[PDB]
Amino acid sequence: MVDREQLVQKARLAEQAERYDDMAAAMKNVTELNEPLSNEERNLLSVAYKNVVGARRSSWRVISSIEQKTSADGNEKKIEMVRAYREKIEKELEAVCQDVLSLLDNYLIKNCSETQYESKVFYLKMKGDYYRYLAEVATGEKRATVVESSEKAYSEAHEISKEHMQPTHPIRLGLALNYSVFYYEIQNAPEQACHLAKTAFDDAIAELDTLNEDSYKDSTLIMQLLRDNLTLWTS
């Protein structure tokens, strides 16, 4: 409808102007309409929220890296101030992630049908990613809760995509890569991560020649992202 089209155009304009907060707000308003989302709007929403979350992720990483050295130094006022700043950044990141997860659960993870598999795998992978993002900055039992939720979503996506897509599919390859990263970083299982990455890469290589021309570039890009984590972890 007309509002949907104008909101999509506004989101694309904000993407052009690098105003990712505005573009994410526009995409959220679009998906609040309770209408199925097409490929272009799905990619736009993914890009917007990925950028918005990544900014805060980088900020939090730098702040924590400085804070550990400052704690080793040992000035109480500096400790208090840096801790307050880190808690503020964490609260902003948590609010963003919680909004993304609630929007994901409320409308578009349930409006999908059974015959639709690509959308289901996409949204389950997004669930896994945005629970891992919360897990990265979590402590205590809430860390365990977010970890097991991320594991649930990722495992469901993997099981659904194992028997419905070609192993050279970009979505399948990206899901395998994110699984391996989650195992290596959150669960601390380098052997599992290496085994999974090696299996996915070998399956992709087996049918690399058959790979269709349009997805050739994306599959090659994701495959080259793989085997690099493999080389780094083996070394």
Binding site: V181, I205, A206, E213, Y216, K217, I222, L225, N229
Partner: protein, 390 residues
Amino acid sequence: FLSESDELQDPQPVWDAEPQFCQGFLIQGLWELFMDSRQKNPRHRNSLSDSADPFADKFLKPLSWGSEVLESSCNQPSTALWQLERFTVPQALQKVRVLKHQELLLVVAVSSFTRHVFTCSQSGIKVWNLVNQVAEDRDPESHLKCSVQDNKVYLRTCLLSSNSRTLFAGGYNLPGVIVWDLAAPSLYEKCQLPCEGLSCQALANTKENMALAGFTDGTVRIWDLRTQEIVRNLKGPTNSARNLVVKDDNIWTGGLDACLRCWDLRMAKVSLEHLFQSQIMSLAHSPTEDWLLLGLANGQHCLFNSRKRDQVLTVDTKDNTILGLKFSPNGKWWASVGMGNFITVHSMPTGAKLFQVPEVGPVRCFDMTENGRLIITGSRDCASVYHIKY
């Protein structure tokens, strides 16, 4: 991050439209006069912000007669002995032409004896001539197809004979290995070389007037060219014959099982076995020495002695999966292509990297002339011609 879209394809090599021909400059100058007769009836401000953070006309020499470029060689720090000068090494590559195939490229071949270029994709083979002086070419001398023969057939590989008189092609659903005659007044198909229910994916020719291929299921078949009957069949594991090298009396085979096998034609039995740390993606053999070059899937370049068979030795470690490999005619340097936008050149004795040339995307195939003057490289759907500067 080392997580999804972790700095992947961030840059982009803006390919130049490469107008540097004086004749074209004159033609364009004469053409703009018609437009102007018919018509009648930068950097912003570079204030206090750093620009080092990423966000007299020069004419290229033409390829005279489609053979040579007619320039002067580069200087050397020291003189060379007669034997020293017998072997030379390149120093740069200069792009001279672009051939516009309309589909994703799979194989290329040159045969600089007749000044032709064969580009093979999944739908057909296009034949170009190098004597057409144009910046970019988009009309081949011929366009061979085989799709109308059956319902849905794919093409995988093409091979060009050493004497440039015969062309071979093989694919997925074909009823055989198509053979074309090139020395006839007309370009026509000659034989069929039956292979009913197999996918070719690899071809080779032997100077004793025999052809051979290695199929997906591991079968390696040998045909007699003058009568087209199957001479020998060899069987190996699946996906183990994606590469094939023929020598005086041995067939060297490598595939995705990370095993290098050596079949002997007399006894039709395996004579050697070797294991590797990753899948073998490319094989090549030097034309003068006894070295076998292996390009692995994890980025390793390995040298093996085909005669002594003592042990392998890794020379250079590329950062990307190797897809193509070929030796120079004098066997003093080799070129490598892969998935990393670069065409790499390495010297022989130690494998030291000499130089690189960026490309637009994953490079799947390349070929070299017999006189070592040109390099054809097909990345996405265009074959680029490079002149080698010595």
